[PDB]
């Protein structure tokens, strides 16, 4: 089997991407944030505290003939940005782009933090990291991908995120029309439950490439590119007037700037992030200070190849017995 679904930016900055997902019988379609940095499929629901719902579409398990309470199971998750959610668990039929999993754990939110409430466009998350990170207790649950894997033509999914445009998540096949050149594969460590890999270095603009190992995660659920302070300083030093602002919470730059590109290494291959991808616009409405899309990972504890980086590539998440990651230009 295979599946193919379009993923669409939630706003004009590509802050996140939503992908329609069919849950239950008859289908209830929710727009979920596919997150290769976590491993819970959770939704706004008929159980979510009413004051914490503001425009989201909810899953109502009592209206699904295939929903079953997973008795005794609870979940609770905290994300890198400080947001969180928790609740109980149903199993139900879940389909993505024509690919169907029966008996999928659908984590029903009883509580969500303010950041989720305030984002009316995101009806929940669909985790695509390794199932070892799943938070369901006392019986840990599998991700949608883990459940689908055995039925897939090939044990892979791909992320093809757009810049200010829709893109695609495919399951079970590699679309050879969706990228240019060849795919370069690189080793993955699953020790922390992430799609963790080591970039071979970077360049800023038309500058020389610096060969240096940068361990980080491929995380579709993180907006920006978070790299070591040394790398980030070298980037922003090429933008007149750019500075790190503790009041704002990162590097800002004059909105009048033309940003240089940023290149990262994948083995001997190179992925180029155009400068425009690094512009996250005014810090507040009407400001002439703009927020940067490359930020320091210092104090996160991990480097994160978020959407800024991933949307510059066609990315293969290879879930074979020995997982690997592939990157191609597009």
User: Phi and psi of 257, rounded to 5°?
Assistant: -70, 155
Tokens for 79, please give them.
Answer: 């994300």
Tokens for 245, please give them.
Answer: 């602002």
* Partners of 328 in beta bridges: 314
> Which residue, among 71, 186, 196, has the nearest Cα to 133 in the 3D structure?
196
Terminal-residue alpha carbon distance, the chain = 25
User: Phi and psi of 148, rounded to 5°?
Assistant: -80, -20
Helices (H), 149-189: none
What lies within 8 Å, CB to CB, of 190 at 6+ separation is 130, 132, 196, 323
> Which residue, among 43, 34, 1, 260, has the nearest Cα to 161 in the 3D structure?
34
- Spell 112-147 as b/e; 16+ CB within 10 A means b: bbeebbebebbbbbbbbbbbebbbbeeeebbbbbbb
**Catalytic residue numbers?**
35, 199
């Amino acid at each position: 089997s295979t599946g193919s679904a379009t993923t669409t930016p939630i706003d004009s900055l590509d802050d996140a991407y939503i992908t329609p997902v069919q849950i239950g019988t008859p289908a209830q379609t929710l727009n979920l944030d596919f997150d290769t940095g976590s491993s819970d499929l959770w939704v706004f629901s008929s159980e979510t505290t009413a004051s914490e719902v503001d425009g989201q579409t909810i899953y109502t398990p009592s209206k699904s003939t295939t929903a079953k309470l997973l008795s005794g199971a609870t979940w609770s998750i905290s994300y890198g940005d400080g947001s969180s959610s928790s609740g109980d668990v149903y199993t139900d039929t879940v389909s993505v782009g024509g690919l169907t999993v029966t008996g999928q754990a659908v984590e029903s939110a009883k509580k969500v933090s303010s950041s989720f409430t305030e984002d009316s466009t995101i009806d929940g998350l669909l985790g695509l990291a390794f199932s070892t990170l799943n938070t369901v207790s006392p019986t840990q649950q599998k991700t949608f991908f883990d459940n689908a894997k055995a039925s897939l033509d090939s044990p892979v999914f791909t992320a093809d995120l757009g810049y200010h445009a829709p893109g695609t998540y495919n399951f079970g096949f590699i679309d050879t029309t969706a990228y240019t050149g060849s795919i370069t594969y690189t080793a993955v460590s699953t020790k922390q439950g992430f799609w963790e890999w080591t970039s071979t270095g970077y360049a800023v603009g038309s500058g020389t490439f610096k060969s240096t190992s940068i361990d980080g995660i491929a995380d579709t659920g993180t907006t920006l590119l978070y790299l070591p302070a040394t790398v980030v300083s070298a980037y922003w030093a090429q933008v007149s007037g750019a500075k790190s602002s503790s009041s704002v919470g990162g590097y800002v730059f004059p909105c009048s700037a033309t940003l240089p590109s940023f290149t990262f290494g994948v083995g001997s291959a190179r992925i180029v992030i155009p400068g425009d991808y690094i512009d996250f616009g005014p810090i507040s409405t009407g400001s002439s200070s703009c927020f940067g899309g490359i930020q320091s990972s210092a104090g996160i504890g991990i480097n994160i190849f978020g959407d800024v980086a991933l949307k510059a590539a066609f990315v293969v998440f290879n879930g074979a017995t020995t997982p690997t990651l592939g990157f191609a230009s597009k």
